[PDB]
């Protein structure tokens, strides 16, 4: 007889912040909602706790396979497809042109990280909690944490090199 | 093991029996340190490639004008001003973005006397009445002269040429 | 991008065993930290699709008059008569590039219709606007004027364009059809996409076949240890099996993270090539093609992009 | 002073300062964020 | 499920985003006990 | 580029011991994956040239 | 050696390329058993 395992999958919670509201949306990922026991079936899984609409807007919380979600308005969680922007085509001919007559000067910020927090972990105090019986069998493992001390120094010599 | 405190292992069990619980605390804490330093060295590699991207942004956007598109900001890059930040550099990118436009008519060349006149700088534009020369990023109409154009071939081989005259500035200067 | 995978410590480590989950709490949070790294690479590949495909948000469309000076652009544009929005090259691009142990495959955010709608919007802005739609608002520029500026970026005067307009467009349309004959015949030309899907497939089957190994125990079956042996003498065989299954799970997250570092450097090279070869004219030498670069036409691909770089040789 | 500790089996190494927190009358010892020994009441005198 | 986000993240404040808490699995209800049939018998009637 | 290297699973772990080699089969194909990672390194060092 | 490439790759079809199968080593044939020389002997003939 064909042995199939019964229906299982991941459970994710789609929710806004606690200072805004408290409603959730349970997503049974990989599970159809005919086999689970105001509902909508997606490709990633059937969604419980969201009102599906036909219009598409700019969303914030992604779900999967094009379906996205946001908290809008007497307020509940809605779900729709991900909008790819406003459609505005440009005309074309063989003898016309479009010349700009004005401009604008804007400042756009760009943030790139360079360095990080240099740490250093010793083998005597982290492994042994001020223990003398721990240190005698620490020498039997050879040179594990001597190589981790060279790796943590090799990270920290690159951090002031990056500056 | 039975406990996490290493003093509770040694002071309660036999020293042949406490040692097998000790190495579970030794190899358990060394494996948590080994997944920390491999996640550290993976994070040290992506923080090097972003700092090398920031050093490329310090060399091209700050020390000069880079001709790249969408590297020193969205649009035509003019200048950049870096600012200090904890664990990174925040760049203020000044860009050139056109806002308002207007539609016109165009032609690639001008047939003056049987020969084709190609534009040297700018493109040929028209407002419906006369034909002018302006650039591609801003509107500034100029009259079509021989200094702004250059002759290349006849009018029978190019596609889209219209008939117009070219103002030669040496011709009114002989009687003036 | 790559394949988004997610694995849990409840089903991959414990084969429906209640005593295995009780001994998993004694080890702390080993499977919690690799769960945070697996969703870190899940949102990284979704950010890699937005960094490469989603350069502009304005969706452009092609005019119905398909006359750009004798230029046949019907092969790189998607067919509206087909139910799938794919191109004539892209029908051959998706054709050549081709369980219950807790391993799941997450779908991406942008689908294949949403990637090709982003691809056709960048392709329509290339032929109708050129280099101006990647620097703000799109302008109406004809196709004869777009080749005048792209020749001027490599020091070539505009006299060879209009005097040889029939010879240039016949050379382009024959070279576009030579791409479709080579991609339909040679399946090994897409090997840079093939090692992305094969290394993800060979990482998954080694997670399954390591469960058959014992890691120093007398059996790999969790039911055979608990039902047959004495329960203080059985539990030392569980700690051999829960350590060997965790170290192979700690192997899989570390090889995927350096593969995530390799797929981040190529997507940053792709987003540079989406902004320099497509959104403008690149003045570099051997970056957007071998020789003097004129223009580029990007195409959609499974976990990647396909660039059609034209060159002046 | 850096001395050794022996408080009904709870061994350690460190100094002893006066605690300013509130404590329980049945409490033997407290634990920090690392879940180890950081505050010990005396079994004879009662100084936490 | 809002408290299941707090139970996994170990925080009393949940920010705006998508979080995975646990996994759903159908529990077993019955237990099938099988055996071979009443064929291949032994002649116990020859002595009993 | 860097120095291309390879390691043997049977020789580095077991110093000519026949009772060590059959006890590596209970660990499975794990030491093949450290062998397959270093041989994949030795291809791309030739590609970088 | 063509069938040696099939066993390590877990496939019945081997493509074009260079593949590593196993390692060669010369097996030992003899065994040299050595002992120290008979000297520094002890006077056992004084009672025997």
């Amino acid at each position: 007889l064909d042995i199939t395992p019964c229906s299982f999958g991941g459970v994710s919670v789609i929710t806004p912040g606690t200072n805004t509201s408290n409603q959730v949306a349970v997503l049974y990922q990989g599970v159809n909602c005919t086999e689970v026991p105001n509902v909508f079936q997606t490709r990633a899984g059937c969604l419980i706790g969201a009102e599906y609409v036909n219009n598409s807007y700019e969303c914030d919380i992604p779900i999967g396979a094009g379906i996205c979600a946001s908290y809008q308005t007497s307020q509940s969680i809605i779900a729709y497809t991900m909008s790819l922007g406003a459609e505005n085509s440009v005309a074309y001919s063989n003898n016309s042109i479009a010349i700009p007559t004005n401009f604008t000067i804007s400042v756009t910020t760009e943030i790139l990280p360079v360095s990080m927090t240099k740490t250093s972990v010793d083998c005597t105090m982290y492994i042994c909690g001020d223990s003398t019986e721990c240190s005698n069998l620490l020498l039997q493992y050879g040179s594990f944490c001597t190589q981790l001390k060279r790796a943590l120094t090799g990270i920290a010599v690159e951090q002031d090199k990056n500056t | 093991a039975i406990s996490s405190v290493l003093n509770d292992i040694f002071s309660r069990l036999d020293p042949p029996e406490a040692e097998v619980q000790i190495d579970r605390l030794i190899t358990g804490r060394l494996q948590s340190l080994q997944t920390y330093v491999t996640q550290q060295l993976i994070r040290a590699a992506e923080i090097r490639a972003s700092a090398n991207l920031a050093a490329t942004k310090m060399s091209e956007c700050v020390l000069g004008q880079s001709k790249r598109v969408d590297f020193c900001g969205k649009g035509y890059h003019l200048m950049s001003f870096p600012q200090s930040a904890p664990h990174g550099v925040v760049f203020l990118h000044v860009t050139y973005v056109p806002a308002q436009e207007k539609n016109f008519t165009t032609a690639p060349a001008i047939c003056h006397d049987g020969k084709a006149h190609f534009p040297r700088e700018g493109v040929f534009v028209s407002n419906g009445t006369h034909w002018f020369v302006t650039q591609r990023n801003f509107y500034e109409p100029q009259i079509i002269t021989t200094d702004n154009t250059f002759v290349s071939g006849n009018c029978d081989v190019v596609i889209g040429i219209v008939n117009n005259t070219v103002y030669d500035p040496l011709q009114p200067e002989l009687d003036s | 991008s790559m394949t988004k995978t997610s694995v849990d410590c409840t089903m991959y480590i414990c084969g429906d065993s209640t005593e295995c989950s009780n001994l998993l709490l004694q080890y702390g949070s080993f499977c919690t930290q690799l769960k945070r790294a697996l969703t870190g690479i899940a949102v990284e590949q979704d950010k890699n699709t937005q960094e490469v495909f989603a350069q502009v948000k304005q969706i452009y469309k092609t005019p119905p008059i398909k006359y750009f000076g004798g230029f046949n652009f019907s092969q790189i544009l998607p067919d509206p008569s087909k139910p799938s929005k794919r191109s004539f090259i892209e029908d051959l691009l998706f054709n050549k590039v081709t369980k219950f142990k807790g391993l799941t495959v997450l779908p991406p955010l942008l689908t294949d219709e949403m990637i090709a709608q982003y691809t056709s919007a960048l392709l329509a802005g290339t032929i109708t606007s050129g280099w101006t739609f990647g620097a703000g608002a799109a302008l109406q520029i004809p196709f004869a004027m777009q080749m005048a500026y792209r020749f001027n970026g490599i020091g070539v005067t505009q006299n060879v364009l209009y005097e040889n307009q029939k010879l240039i467009a016949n050379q382009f349309n024959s070279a576009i059809g030579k791409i479709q004959d080579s991609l339909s015949s040679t399946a090994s030309a897409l090997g840079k996409l093939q090692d992305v899907v094969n290394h993800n497939a060979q990482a998954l089957n080694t997670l399954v076949k390591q469960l058959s190994s014992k890691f120093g125990a007398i059996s790999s079956v969790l039911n055979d240890i608990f039902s047959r042996l004495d329960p203080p003498e059985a539990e030392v065989q569980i700690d051999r099996l829960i350590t060997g299954r965790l170290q192979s799970l700690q192997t899989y997250v570390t090889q995927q993270l350096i593969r995530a570092a390799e797929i981040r450097a190529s997507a940053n090279l792709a987003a540079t090539k989406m902004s320099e070869c497509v959104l403008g004219q690149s003045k570099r030498v051997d970056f957007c093609g071998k020789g003097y670069h004129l223009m580029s036409f990007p195409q959609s691909a499974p976990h990647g992009v396909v660039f059609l770089h034209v060159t002046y040789v | 002073k850096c001395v050794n500790f022996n408080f009904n089996g709870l061994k350690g190494t460190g100094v002893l300062t006066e605690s300013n927190k509130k404590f329980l009358p049945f409490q033997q010892f407290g634990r920090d964020i690392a879940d180890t020994t950081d505050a010990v009441r005396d079994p004879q005198t009662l100084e936490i | 499920p809002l408290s299941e986000t707090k139970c996994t993240l170990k925080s009393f404040t949940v920010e705006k985003g998508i979080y995975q808490t646990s996994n759903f699995r159908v529990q077993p209800t019955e237990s099938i006990v099988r055996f071979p049939n009443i064929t291949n018998l032994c002649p116990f009637d020859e002595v009993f």
Side-chain angles (χ1 to χ4, degrees), chain A residues 3 7 15 17-18 26 39 52 59 96-97 112 133 135 141-142 145:
Chain A
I3 300 175
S7 173
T15 172
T18 53
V26 186
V39 72
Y52 183 69
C59 64
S96 57
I97 213 169
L112 265 303
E133 58 263 12
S135 315
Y141 278 87
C145 40

Side-chain angles (χ1 to χ4, degrees), chain A residues 101-141:
Chain A
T101 180
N102 215 332
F103 58 94
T104 178
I105 299 175
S106 87
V107 172
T108 308
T109 174
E110 276 188 353
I111 296 104
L112 265 303
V114 174
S115 316
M116 48 91 63
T117 298
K118 307 179 295 182
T119 74
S120 44
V121 175
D122 50 343
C123 202
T124 167
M125 293 301 298
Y126 179 70
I127 310 294
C128 314
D130 57 277
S131 178
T132 78
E133 58 263 12
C134 169
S135 315
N136 304 272
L137 304 99
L138 199 58
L139 265 301
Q140 308 297 314
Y141 278 87

Side-chain angles (χ1 to χ4, degrees), chain C residues 142-167:
Chain C
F143 208 79
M145 286 288 111
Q146 279 177 21
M147 303 306 118
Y149 168 66
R150 281 163 172 169
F151 283 163
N152 274 22
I154 53 170
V156 172
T157 324
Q158 314 173 8
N159 315 333
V160 300
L161 171 70
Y162 293 97
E163 291 167 4
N164 300 271
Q165 203 166 337
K166 298 181 183 178
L167 271 299

Side-chain angles (χ1 to χ4, degrees), chain B residues 1 24 28 31-32 35 38-39 42 45-46 53 67-71 74-76 96-99 101 103 106-108 118-120 122-124 136-137 150-154 157-159, chain C residues 26 30 33 37 55-56 131-132 134-140 142 144-145 148-149 152 157-159 162-163 165 235-236 239 243 247 250 254 257-258 264 272 275-276 279-281 283-284:
Chain B
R24 292 185 184 181
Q31 274 177 2
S32 58
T35 180
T38 46
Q39 277 183 357
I42 280 164
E46 52 205 289
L53 163 64
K67 302 184 179 181
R68 295 174 163 189
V69 191
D70 202 351
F71 181 69
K74 178 185 182 183
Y76 295 98
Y96 183 76
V97 170
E101 67 265 11
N103 292 327
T106 188
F118 281 86
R120 189 164 58 98
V123 290
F124 288 156
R136 283 147 295 193
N137 296 123
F150 64 100
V151 66
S152 311
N154 49 334
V157 285
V158 306
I159 307 173
Chain C
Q26 299 183 6
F30 295 143
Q33 299 167 7
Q55 297 281 338
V56 284
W131 68 97
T132 59
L139 312 160
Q140 180 170 350
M145 286 288 111
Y149 168 66
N152 274 22
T157 324
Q158 314 173 8
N159 315 333
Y162 293 97
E163 291 167 4
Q165 203 166 337
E235 55 99 17
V236 296
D239 298 320
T243 319
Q247 184 45 43
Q250 285 179 356
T254 52
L257 267 166
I258 50 183
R264 269 171 72 177
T272 310
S275 44
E276 271 314 282
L279 294 181
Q281 187 180 12
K283 293 189 178 181
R284 307 194 218 177

Side-chain angles (χ1 to χ4, degrees), chain A residues 2-159:
Chain A
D2 195 20
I3 300 175
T4 310
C6 53
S7 173
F8 82 110
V11 188
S12 187
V13 172
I14 310 167
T15 172
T18 53
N19 301 334
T20 60
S21 165
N22 45 2
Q23 208 59 48
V24 294
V26 186
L27 174 83
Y28 286 88
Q29 208 169 23
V31 188
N32 288 335
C33 55
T34 63
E35 307 295 316
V36 166
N38 294 327
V39 72
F40 178 65
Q41 174 80 65
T42 76
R43 301 178 176 178
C46 192
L47 183 53
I48 299 178
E51 184 180 5
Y52 183 69
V53 287
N54 302 332
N55 302 334
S56 182
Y57 309 102
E58 309 102 318
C59 64
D60 300 74
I61 302 107
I63 309 172
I67 317 290
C68 192
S70 157
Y71 191 76
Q72 293 306 306
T73 63
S74 87
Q75 292 175 340
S76 45
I77 315 177
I78 56 177
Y80 38 82
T81 176
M82 166 62 168
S83 50
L84 312 176
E87 195 266 330
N88 187 29
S89 196
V90 195
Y92 175 72
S93 72
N94 304 325
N95 43 6
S96 57
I97 213 169
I99 304 307
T101 180
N102 215 332
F103 58 94
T104 178
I105 299 175
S106 87
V107 172
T108 308
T109 174
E110 276 188 353
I111 296 104
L112 265 303
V114 174
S115 316
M116 48 91 63
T117 298
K118 307 179 295 182
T119 74
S120 44
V121 175
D122 50 343
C123 202
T124 167
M125 293 301 298
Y126 179 70
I127 310 294
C128 314
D130 57 277
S131 178
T132 78
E133 58 263 12
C134 169
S135 315
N136 304 272
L137 304 99
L138 199 58
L139 265 301
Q140 308 297 314
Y141 278 87
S143 157
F144 286 163
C145 40
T146 320
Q147 301 162 12
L148 318 173
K149 274 166 189 178
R150 292 169 185 174
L152 281 167
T153 321
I155 284 166
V157 74
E158 203 81 3
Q159 294 318 294

Side-chain angles (χ1 to χ4, degrees), chain C residues 119-134:
Chain C
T119 319
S120 45
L122 287 155
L123 273 164
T126 306
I127 50 171
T128 52
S129 63
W131 68 97
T132 59
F133 85 113

